[PDB]
Symmetry: C3
Subunit: 416 residues, 3 copies
């Protein structure tokens, strides 16, 4: 059965299974007897994340010039900010069509300390990479791996045979590791149809029943807005750089479906990278840098979930956001999506920062704190679709930057 089209079978069936079990009251059998298999699928991808990030980027940063890496960053970051900003802008319009939370009708009454930005930045530079590796801190690994692979290529270009042979040997240890990791990613993706089925079956069972109210109308709204981001911003950007966007989606889909049901960008980095190499044809000089960075700081789906649910609260308490306030949201939902860790649920946690920025404080027991908790009740329903666009923008950004740097192997894009 076509493995491009079989992981898609597990997604649908688990969704029907979980919706059916959820609508019929067996979600506790699904948590006990089905949830563990998706958890196994999650643990397997998780173990690959730290080595496959470290090794691919040491290799990739050696296997390219600094000035390219530097131009890749400036390019990928210019793309990343603007695709995030467009996501906020799309959620705001999609939130109004669906008219989210206007019928929740809570009275509220007429109404900062922004987190230090510098310490988050200094936090990029690790102070012990063995610790950042053991703690799982991807962004500090990205920094050390680039710094390291850059130094390895410098040492490969030295007059000594003794120095060249030591540095070149080190780089082979990383190349040996990276090639081994991409191998297992492909092997675990044999189980991927099952883990997908279990995760979506557990999720649909627990919060299926909850997608029935104006929360259901929220879900309708968030998924619609995510879609526009793809078919408008990604397809147009993809088609703009001469990439058949249908060939792009057809290649991304393994990374999209694991992103969806694991609700973790960082947890689906291995599939996103293996998709970026085998299917997409990107060179490690590119995706070994952009794909892990984007798993953290490029969350188009979160920046749009945050845009849609922020309108839901202000409507739900009778203090709708003015225009001048929605323009603060574009700034601050981008900032919060940059800050959102790539693990399940962290986007809701960061949504608070976005409210605190427009003057909707979450004082406990207040009407605002009530609307926030209506959202967190369907968070997994919205979490799946959110992480998917967080990854898809990482691939569309990697593929687009690659065709710009001549680092895209066009032999992989031929319907024959």
């Amino acid at each position: 059965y076509p493995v491009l089209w079989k992981i898609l079978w597990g997604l649908v069936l688990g969704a029907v299974f979980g919706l059916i079990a959820g609508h019929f009251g067996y979600a506790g059998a699904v948590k006990t007897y089905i949830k563990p298999f998706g958890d196994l699928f999650v643990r397997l991808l998780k173990m690959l994340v730290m080595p496959i990030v470290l090794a691919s980027l040491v290799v990739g940063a050696a296997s390219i010039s600094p000035a390219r890496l530097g131009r890749v960053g400036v390019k990928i970051v210019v793309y990343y900010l603007a695709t995030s900003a467009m996501a906020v802008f799309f959620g705001l319009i999609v939130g109004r069509l669906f008219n989210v939370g206007a019928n929740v009708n809570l009275g509220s009454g007429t109404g900062a300390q922004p987190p230090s930005l510098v310490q988050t930045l200094l936090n990029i530079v690790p102070t012990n990479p063995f610790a950042s590796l053991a703690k799982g801190e991807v962004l500090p690994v990205i920094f050390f791996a680039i710094i390291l692979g850059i130094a390895i290529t410098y040492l490969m270009n030295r007059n000594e045979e003794r120095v060249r042979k030591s540095a070149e040997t080190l780089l082979r240890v990383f190349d040996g590791l990276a090639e081994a990791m991409y191998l297992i990613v492909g092997g675990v993706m044999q189980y991927a149809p099952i883990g997908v089925f279990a995760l979506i079956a557990y999720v649909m069972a627990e919060q299926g029943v909850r997608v029935v109210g104006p929360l259901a109308k929220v879900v309708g709204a968030v998924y619609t807005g995510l879609f526009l981001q793809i078919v408008i911003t990604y397809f147009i950007l993809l088609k703009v750089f001469g990439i058949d966007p249908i060939k792009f989606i057809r290649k991304a889909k393994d990374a999209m479906i694991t992103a969806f049901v694991t609700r973790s960008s960082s947890g689906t980095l291995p599939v996103t990278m293996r998709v970026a190499e085998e299917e997409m044809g990107v060179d490690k000089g590119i995706f070994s840098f952009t794909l892990p960075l984007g798993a953290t700081i490029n969350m188009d789906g979160t920046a749009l979930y945050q845009g849609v649910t922020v309108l839901f609260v202000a409507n739900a308490i009778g203090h709708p956001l003015t225009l001048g306030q929605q323009l603060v949201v574009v700034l601050t939902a981008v900032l919060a999506s940059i800050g959102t860790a790539g693990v399940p649920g962290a986007g809701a946690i960061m949504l608070a920062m976005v409210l605190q920025s427009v003057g909707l404080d979450l004082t406990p027991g207040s009407p605002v704190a009530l609307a926030y908790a209506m959202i967190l009740g369907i968070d997994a329903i919205l979490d799946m679709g959110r992480t998917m666009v967080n990854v898809t923008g990482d691939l569309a950004g990697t593929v687009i930057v690659a065709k710009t740097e001549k680092e895209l192997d066009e032999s992989k894009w031929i319907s024959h």
Copy 2:
């Protein structure tokens, strides 16, 4: 550059047996004569150094040997080796509880404690998922062996795949990586050998401290617990291990003389995981087993195959249940076999975890450790002599790991018969 240097000249297997016998005589003297606090202060640190040294080697020598060994074998074999070692571990655990129950009733442990007592899916799955690590750098830093065993097996297998490629580039990268582990494994096994120079001293100290602290306590019905447990541990070795060993054509007397360094070390460190470096170096040099086997069976067995604990748990549960005037019926002892096997599989390879898990074995037959009850009193009588019993069991926990590794090896033709001829 010191003043004095004279040690290190004797058969280390014979001198490690010298430190064990002498330390037991020494600690017993401080016990009945009251210098047990000098031994904890002035002798225990040497046994502690010997433990830290073996401890530093565990994570590299498991990771490297199993990456090496797992690349150096075919998966369809590895899967059959696992199936073989796993069925052996279960049957021998079941056999140990079966022996502890029989040896426990023969010695009749705790039948005369005379405490009055009033006549009055969910949990295992996460333990399995937890075998799969979610970050191996962390599982390494945290010391999580079973997650590393998993990663190491999974890794080396991928390395052999890459060594078989049309590319000269992929083959040589994998081939290079594989050398780093092989380089690491050989360096670890080297240091194991250097450290085992200190082992006659470290063995002497550990047994001297334990015998000093808990010697005095082995005088009462706890002494009869000791009598039962050692008798069963002895029976488990000379009956089930010897009969099992001889059935597959291994001289059981040759096994013990090769195992002894691991046996004596497991005994005095009371930690399977802590005697793994000696257990593997013994599996290679003395036993003649190939890294394709013991790099998997020896770390897997240090955790999940505890024959010595599974017999300890059978004897002490009979001791407690007899001690409250509600002796165990047969139908319960068949639950003890079911549940002490389960609880011995769960017992971590650290000193004392068998008592901590012994509680789970009691909870399974209806002896709750509610505070102030008679039951909690008998459990604490056991925890009072746990070290005296901890030594003898970890010896049989490890002795059974070597016996299982060698027996599985000869069925896969992977044992070097040149060490067994003379």
Copy 3:
């Protein structure tokens, strides 16, 4: 240029702390010093592990063993001299005699065993240098043994492994040099922040402590280091000129362990020591060889007892020499840890830090200027590591005599 940022930042921070903009300096200049510290920090664990595995293979145990026996004997004697200087310099300045406070008239072994790691992957993640030092020696010693095997097969495995450490060390030393491009800025920021916050406080008998502590630190360099250096035939003006990057990085980061990458690259590029030496003596000395701490402790211990009217007797000052040496060995190589350990030196002559007591006030006067004293302290903590590594290296002929000629 690292020496210009040090001068300019100190003049700058003194001015800002004098217009009350020390919180403007903490807000807008301290981060550059923190980047420079995080950058140097990331390198310590790899560049220590790799350099010592390499260096320990590339030398004989009996040398390493004799180097150790030599470096440890050097380490003790130079430390003991510092306290004797702090006692003399603290007594010369008569520190804290005008504080006039009335006072009432009437596990070590585990730290040793702690050197032996129990999981080296963990000791790596934790930043525990000394347990890595032990494992790296134990490892690298094993590699040459396997490279000195009859096998072609094992010779190539270990030779492969050793190259991984050599490849890593060479990248580490490379990055240290690149990070030192930023160092003129990071130095400026750190000294500007410290001068801003604690400048104002060098004004009282605290000023005389700063005067006293720095004066003795200088003698340790210009007397004991220079005399010992000249005794083994090393030009001290060429030495300091080579040491300076490690000195000034140690000065403004107040972390010996944080200056390890600069101290080692100075030991290789500038000094010319072989990894068989400095990859063992320099990380060992960052922890246990603190001349600068032992002199602070001698001067400030005199400061407390004078400030409370129970001056130390001779028999007591001779306990300070023993115990300020011991406390400097125990002081971690991070900012401030010498002050924390000064407490153990006070308790050693009977100045207990019972809360609210007169003793506890003099301690807190000292902790108010700790950073002003911490900078000068960590500088002589590494400066003594370089001087001894070079001196011990020349005794094992492992010093490159070509870098000391023009």
